[PDB]
Ligand SMILES: [Ca+2]
C-alpha cells in the first residue's frame with residue numbers, strides 16, 4: 266500500500282495515468298477551492314507524512330504559509346515548474362513581479378510537466394520503471410494529439426475576435442500559445458490578446474480602475490463575450506458587462522481556471538470548446 270501525493274487535480278490526474286493501479290494517488294486540493302490561498306486542513310500533514318512523493322506546481326502556486334512550512338526543504342517535493350525551468354522547457358510569464366503559475370493551460374508545457382512526473386516517479390520506483398514508462402508514453406502522445414487539436418480548433422477563431430476576457434489572469438500561457446501569432450510571440454504583443462479585472466491570484470482586491478480597464482479593453486477590441494470561471498467570484502465581470510454602452514454577454518459555460526471539472530483532460534477540452542465556439546470558431550472533431 267504505497268501513497269503518492271499531488272497538490273491539485275491538474276497534477277494528480279496525470280500522475281495517476283502514469284502509475285495506474287500500482288500506487289494510491291491522493292490529492293490535497295480539489296473541488297471549488299482556490300489553490301492559490303489554500304491553507305492546510307487537519308489531516309493534510311499526515312497525507313504528506315504517509316506519502317512517498319509530493320508533486321507541486323511551483324511558480325508560487327503553493328505560496329500559503331501553511332504549505333511553505335511543509336514543502337520548502339522537503340525531500341519528497343517534486344517542483345514541476347522549477348524542473349521545467351531548469352531546462353528552459355518554457356519561458357516563464359510574470360505579472361508585476363510575481364511568477365505566473367498557470368502553465369497547465371498550455372498542453373505542450375503540461376506535456377513537458379508530465380515528462381518530469383514520469384521521470385520523477387520512475388526514479389522513486391525502479392521496480393515499476395516499465396509499466397510507468399508504457400503509461401507515460403501513452404498519455405504523452407495523447408496530450409500531443411490534444412495539443413494539435415486545440416491549436417487547430419482555436420485557429421478557426423476569426424483573428425478580429427482573438428481577445429480573451431476572463432475572471433482572473435489564468436490563461437496567459439493559453440493565449441500566448443493558441444491565440445497569438447509567431448510575430449506576437451516574439452514581440453510580446455500577444456499580451457494584447459487577454460485581459461481580466463483580477464490578477465494572478467483571486468485574493469487581490471479588484472478596484473473600479475480594474476473594472477474600467479477591462480471595460481475600455483472590451484470597447485477598444487469590440488469584444489462581444491466574456492468568460493466566467495468556476496469558483497471565482499463573478500461580481501467584477503458582471504459589473505463590467507453591465508457597464509457597457511453595445512452588445513456584450515457572458516459565455517454560456519464557465520471556464521475552469523484553477524481547478525478541474527471531472528478530469529484535467531476533459532476540462533482542457535471543455536475550455537477549448539467553450540472559447541472556440543463563443544469567439545466564433547468551429548471545433549474540430
Ligand atoms: Ca513529510
Ligand SMILES: [Fe+3]
Pocket residue numbers: 301367433434435465466467522523
Ligand atoms: Fe489562478
Ligand code: NA
Pocket residue numbers: 472474475
Ligand atoms: Na488598481
Ligand code: NA
Pocket residue numbers: 483484485486487
Ligand atoms: Na468599439
